[PDB]
Design a protein around this ligand. Structure first.
Ligand code: CA
Ligand code: CA
Ligand code: CA
Ligand code: FE
Ligand code: FE
Lengths: 511, 387, 168, 388, 72
């Protein structure tokens, strides 16, 4: 019988579980409260070579589209100015999430004892490396072919200037790798990916398409095809510890802490980027958020884990209460501090203000009037000598940074949550914006010692911080960040220096 | 519908008109090069560097970091997400490393995919061509199934040894290289099983089960010291660099290279077996690929660091000495395998020549790099005592 | 000279550590630096913005000196002070497992880090301790995590409440 | 400029609006399958079939053609562009053939490209690993350089035997298959030279010039009859099917398989040569791929033709007899090479068994398909006479 | 010396002209009034493998555009 014969991935995976053997020190090197069952299986029967082939095929289409047709159509240019800027943030911030997920799954790979479960995590390790490079490519492409490369070309260093970055690192960097491997798994897979990233990625391609961007859909839709393996990894993580007695004792708490952590940042940030970083709208964030968090994740997804002792986060109702105005409250702060970004922002135009009021009754009377006030005062004109932060100071509206989530908040002006808790401990002041984060710090003070921008920049003049952290464009004088998205009247380092803006630590007002 | 309901900004007349109207006359910055601030290793910055360097959000307190401040969330206890405390080695910049092959994810899976598809074609031709007819039955049912199969657990162990490094690596360029070094190891392990699975399909009574080769690995005598060295590099080392250095610049460079190249790749051909060498060609291609990266990280970057050159070489000579002993011990236990070969297969003269090839290659490519004075004669002499 | 990555306070410490030329002195200064400037239990927050970078530059001096002073066997098994790594490790783990509560456990772990963080203790033993110590700390802290009301939890932590504001 | 001057109908607001306004509400026909009228070989029509079948504009007077009338311009004298007169074989439909591997251009160059890049990786790994050190010097300088090298001319000749068929094949599916069978032959000849070029780089004194191997091929004894056979198959055969059939189902199936698999692939490993087998693995992979196509065209389509089965088998048996004699002669002369080997390399029994493997595979995969009564011991005995 | 080495198309093509050999019947099978010079050369130094690679690269971009973005 000389019939052409071969062997496929499944036929080899068949014996993968037997690859691991027993010996005294064969155990995880990382601290954990749980015990992953050594007989846990994986949903996709892959081996290194087949994994490579399936991903290579996707790369082929993706890069082929980008280098050929899309470039021929000048797809990198024919995008709305606001969205070109928004993708500087979206692609780079997601990149760090993809990058830390590599280390995260590597930690999970080390945690798993069953060969198959290790292999599942391993596949993700490689996927997250692919995703890191894919998000990087989006910025790379827009820098090379777009209307404004500044920011797209150096976000890896210019992102360190602003406050939005700190919070990103909490949910997409440290939240993924610092803690009990299982806790990190919940932040990354059970919550992060299943509740946000997965739906987000697709949503991003929708807002991108509506605003002329066919680059992002090409890349992000390809990334999305990998997410089913990661969902399974997260689901399998719970299955792996479901029997361990410690599970009933700790699972629901780590999950609730994980849920709060992720939603605390994305609830306001994603909504802000979508609604304020676009011209054409796809769907109101309030509607989107409700479906994602309550319907899909909180309902269907969490519900399927019920048989494993998983319960809906106790902080769920609280999240919904704080959500409604969250993203609207945040943009006010983001725009007020525009000189600290690495992207250009725009105020809502007439059609947009009508859209906001139609979808968020009461929007105009609060946010609308403020934006028109700032604009008439000249916040878009460099000769005005005005940046919105001055307005916050004048009207005694201090801006704080939550010690845990790093999310900026202004309880004095917020239409949403306005709670504030300030404590002093061993010569250091701390500010918190909610009861969940407050508990986290109180119980685990050594896990949260992140210096906020007011602490680091205290006493420093604004233009000096920008110059030092390279927040300038090629000519070495014009700011990367801008308070408008037009091609003329760009603000320079001089326009900022003349404002004589010096940072102060708002918490010291309580001394 | 034929046109669909969704309107796209690039093609929809109304939306596109609005977008075009908002566009500036020319780009708002002439610098269209992402990663322009990265120091090029070669003539010009490569895609590999632009897409990888500085992806890791390290602050300046971790040599090379561009960010500032502490991490936002740490481990219960205070341990940082990533920190200098996870490895003995020190440097002026953890982002200096560069894979000589400049492999980011795309090129990496492209190359491995080609190998998978060619492998498939090869097997279909091998079976159709009936080349199995000329293979020595004993070599197959005994040395390929049991001893070669057993070696898969060795590779699998070196694979897992990379797990912690995937989590602790202090830079992107180092994490990527580490991940690829490890992934290639699991690939090899899976290719060993694949061959055994192939033989099972074309050879009536061949059993693909890993029971036999596993028992050999866990209980046998030939791989006893090999397994002990593996269980140690994997689960007893908590320093990601010691793990990678000792696995690639010590153990696998000596034991691994001898078994694969000087034993199976050297003897399989003599038994009419061109099947196994097909896969060993991959393992060796992979070994030589990783070697260029290992050399760049520990010698070009760390071993020759402008500020910690002396320090690092001392630490590596220390590690070299620490693991050189368990490696030599592994090579000794393996020598016992020659006594199971049919008479006339090879002689003590050939083996001695093969050992010097491995040792000399090792001294030339690794030992001399950190000024680790090693004695070829004593090592070879030490190993030969296992016959 | 002010600055985020380069400033007078940082230049001051580099000239300071440079004066060091003895593992004993170097190691001692590092140990004292971690006591005065790291963790929520630090003696002061005066160097909050530069202590992370300074500590590293200090660890480097200690590392170099420790390699030139110790022999191969010791560099792998003894602390920069002379202690037997494994001894310290097993002892700390012993005390941790004896901890009666989370308040006691957290103190053991944090102190361990301040005292034996590399280059002091060999990374292999250190990270092995992080693995065992952290496990115990979490097990104690995460049990009935939400039982204690915030008002009471604040008293337990011993924080000085400066301001509370809640409309709901 | 940033936007460019050329306006495109897909993205230009004004132009796209004009285009959209002219579009129908739905497609003017729901049959969106190109090649829907082609009879599928398998369950559903494949992309291979759709893009290939009926590309050749044959009229109905050439079996299976869908066009009508004479060609528009013929050769001086009147010979048709393509015609039944170019081959002895007959069929109900020249478009019935199907490459079992379904290779159209894209998949074909994709696979060869993978093989090329992997080959490059292999050589860089082989050289860096210093595996050349254990290769027997005599085998290298004498058998690889001279005898394996001379074989490149054999494969080169077989490649050229396909030129006329590239021009005369009576259908697209056969033309594509034939072109690919031929292209793989030149590739193998080039891989033999590639190996010699590689050895010249890693072995001081090794000369990559083709002078020596060419002199062996053109004037040596070992390959004398092989060359005489190749010269005939290539330039004395004017029938495109006799050429393809006799090359693949007779000469290469016997002589080619013996040299590649039973001599070099079999003995190279014994001299510590893992290099040559790397390339022979490719040659054997190519050989087995072409075999599936050759069998489908000559046995499934022509030899089993509902109307010309008996006729076609008679013709192929005729061709087999015609070319088996020159093929046995080629193998007989090649037997002379065994005497050049170092004593103890192999012996008469091993050589005989290897000949029987080749003959038995040939009877199974080819001769039996057309009822050619081959006598395996008589063929082997005729070849063994060449042993010195 | 074990420096990573390989062989490219031009290096093999250098000897391609020598692949053909002389024999009585080595002549075109088609009618023609002309005689193509025996030592004519070619501009591009390609071999089968390299030809395939360069065309495979083009195909990837082409089909990728057609299947992905253009379809979307
Ligand atoms: Ca003769
Ligand atoms: Ca005999
Ligand atoms: Ca007979
Ligand atoms: Fe991802
Ligand atoms: Fe993911």
């Amino acid at each position: 019988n000389r019939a052409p014969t071969s062997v496929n991935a499944q036929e080899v995976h068949r014996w993968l579980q037997s690859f691991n053997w027993d010996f005294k020190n064969n155990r995880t090197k990382y601290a954990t409260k749980y015990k992953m069952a050594n007989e846990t299986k994986e949903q996709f029967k892959l081996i290194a070579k087949e994994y490579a082939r399936m991903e290579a095929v996707k790369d082929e289409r993706q890069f082929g589209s980008l280098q050929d047709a899309l470039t021929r159509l000048n797809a990198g240019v024919r995008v709305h100015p606001k969205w070109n800027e928004t993708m500087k943030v979206v692609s780079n911030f997601l990149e760090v999430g993809e990058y830390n997920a590599i280390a995260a799954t590597g930690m999970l790979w080390d945690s798993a004892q069953a060969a198959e479960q290790k292999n599942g995590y391993l596949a993700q390790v490689l996927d997250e490396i692919r995703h890191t490079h894919q998000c990087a490519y989006v910025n790379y492409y827009f820098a090379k072919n777009g209307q404004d490369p500044a920011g797209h070309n150096d976000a890896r260093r210019t992102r360190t200037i602003g406050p939005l970055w700190k919070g990103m690192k909490r949910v997409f960097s440290d939240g993924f790798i610092s803690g009990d491997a299982v806790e990190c798994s919940l932040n990354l897979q059970l919550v992060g990916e299943a509740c946000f990233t997965n739906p987000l990625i697709v949503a991003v391609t929708e807002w991108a398409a509506a605003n002329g961007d066919e680059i992002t859909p090409t890349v992000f839709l390809s990334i999305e095809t990998d997410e089913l393996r990661h969902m399974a990894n997260g689901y399998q993580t719970v299955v792996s510890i479901a029997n361990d007695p410690a599970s009933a004792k700790y699972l629901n708490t780590d999950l609730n802490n994980a849920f709060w952590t992720q939603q605390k940042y994305f609830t306001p940030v994603l909504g802000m980027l979508f609604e304020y970083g676009s011209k054409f709208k796809v769907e109101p964030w309030v509607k989107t958020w409700d479906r994602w968090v309550y319907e899909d994740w909180g309902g269907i997804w969490i519900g399927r884990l019920g048989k494993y002792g998983v319960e809906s986060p106790r902080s769920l109702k609280d999240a919904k209460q704080d959500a409604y105005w969250a993203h609207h409250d945040l943009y006010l702060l983001a725009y007020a501090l525009w000189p600290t970004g690495f992207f250009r922002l725009a105020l809502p135009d007439q059609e947009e203000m009508e859209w906001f009021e139609a979808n968020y009754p009461g929007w105009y009377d609060h946010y609308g009037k403020i934006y028109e006030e700032w604009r008439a005062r000249g916040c878009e004109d460099p000769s005005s000598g005005f940046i919105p932060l001055m307005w916050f100071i004048e009207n005694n509206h201090p801006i704080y940074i939550d010690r845990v989530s790093q999310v900026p908040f202004c309880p004095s002006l917020a239409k949403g949550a306005s709670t504030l808790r300030v404590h002093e401990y061993n010569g250091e002041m701390h500010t918190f914006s909610d009861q969940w984060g407050e508990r986290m710090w109180l119980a685990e003070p050594e896990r949260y010692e992140c210096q906020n921008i007011f602490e680091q920049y205290e006493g420093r003049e604004l233009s000096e911080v920008i110059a030092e952290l390279h927040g300038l464009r090629s000519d070495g004088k014009t700011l990367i960040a801008q308070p408008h998205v037009r091609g003329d009247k760009l603000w320079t380092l001089d326009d900022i220096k003349r404002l004589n803006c010096v940072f102060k630590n708002p918490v010291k007002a309580f001394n | 519908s034929m046109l669909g309901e969704r309107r796209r900004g690039l093609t929809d007349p109304e939306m596109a008109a609005v977008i075009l109207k908002a566009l500036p006359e020319a780009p708002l910055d002439g610098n269209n090069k992402m990663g322009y601030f990265v120091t090029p290793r070669w003539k010009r910055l490569t895609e590999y560097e632009a897409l990888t360097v500085y992806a890791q959000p390290n602050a300046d307190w971790i040599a090379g970091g561009l960010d500032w401040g502490d991490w936002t969330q740490k481990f219960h206890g205070g341990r940082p997400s990533w920190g200098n405390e996870t490895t003995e080695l020190r440097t002026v910049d953890w982002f200096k490393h560069r894979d000589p092959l400049r492999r980011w994810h795309a090129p990496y899976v492209k190359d491995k995919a080609e190998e998978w598809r060619y492998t498939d074609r090869f097997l279909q031709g091998y079976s159709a061509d009936g080349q199995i007819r000329a293979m020595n039955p004993t070599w197959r049912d005994e040395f390929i199934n049991r001893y070669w199969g057993a070696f898969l657990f060795n590779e699998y162990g070196l694979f897992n040894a990379h797990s912690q490094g995937a989590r602790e690596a202090l830079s992107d360029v180092t994490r990527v290289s580490l991940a690829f070094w490890g992934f290639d190891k699991i690939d090899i392990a899976q290719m060993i099983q694949l061959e055994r699975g192939f033989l099972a399909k074309i050879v009536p009574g061949f059993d693909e089960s890993t029971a036999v080769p596993k028992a050999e690995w866990t209980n046998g005598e030939v791989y006893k010291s090999a397994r002990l060295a593996v269980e140690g590099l994997w689960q007893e080392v908590f320093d990601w660099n010691e793990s990678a250095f000792s696995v690639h610049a010590v153990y696998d460079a000596l034991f691994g290279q001898f078994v694969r190249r000087e034993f199976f790749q050297r003897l399989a051909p003599r038994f009419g077996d061109n099947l196994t060498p097909f896969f060993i060609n991959q393992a060796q291609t992979y070994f030589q690929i990783a070697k260029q990266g290992v050399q760049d990280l520990y010698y070009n970057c760390l071993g020759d660091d402008p500020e910690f050159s002396d320090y690092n070489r001392t630490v590596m000579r220390n590690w070299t000495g620490k693991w050189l002993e368990p490696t030599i011990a592994a090579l000794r236990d393996f020598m016992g395998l020659f006594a199971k070969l049919p008479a006339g297969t090879t002689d003590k003269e050939e083996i001695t020549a093969s050992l010097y090839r491995v040792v000399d290659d090792w001294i030339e490519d690794y030992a001399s790099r950190i000024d680790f004075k090693a004695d070829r004669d004593q090592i070879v002499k030490a190993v030969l005592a296992g016959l | 000279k002010l600055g985020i990555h380069s400033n007078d306070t940082r230049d001051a410490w580099v000239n300071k550590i440079a004066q060091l030329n003895t593992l004993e002195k170097a190691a001692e200064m590092l140990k004292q630096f971690r006591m005065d400037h790291t963790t929520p239990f630090r003696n002061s927050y005066e160097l909050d913005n530069d202590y992370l970078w300074i500590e590293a530059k200090l660890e480097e001096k200690v590392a170099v000196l420790k390699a030139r002073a110790f022999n191969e066997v010791d560099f792998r098994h003894k602390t920069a002070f002379g202690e037997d790594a494994k001894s310290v490790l097993d002892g700390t783990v012993a005390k941790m497992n004896a901890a009666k509560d989370k308040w006691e456990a957290e103190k053991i772990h944090i102190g361990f880090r301040q005292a034996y963080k590399p280059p002091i203790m060999p990374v292999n033993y250190f990270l092995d301790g992080e693995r065992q110590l952290g496990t115990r700390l979490m097990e104690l802290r995460n049990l009935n995590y939400y039982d204690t009301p915030l008002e009471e939890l604040r008293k337990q932590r011993g924080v000085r409440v400066v301001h509370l504001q809640s409309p709901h």
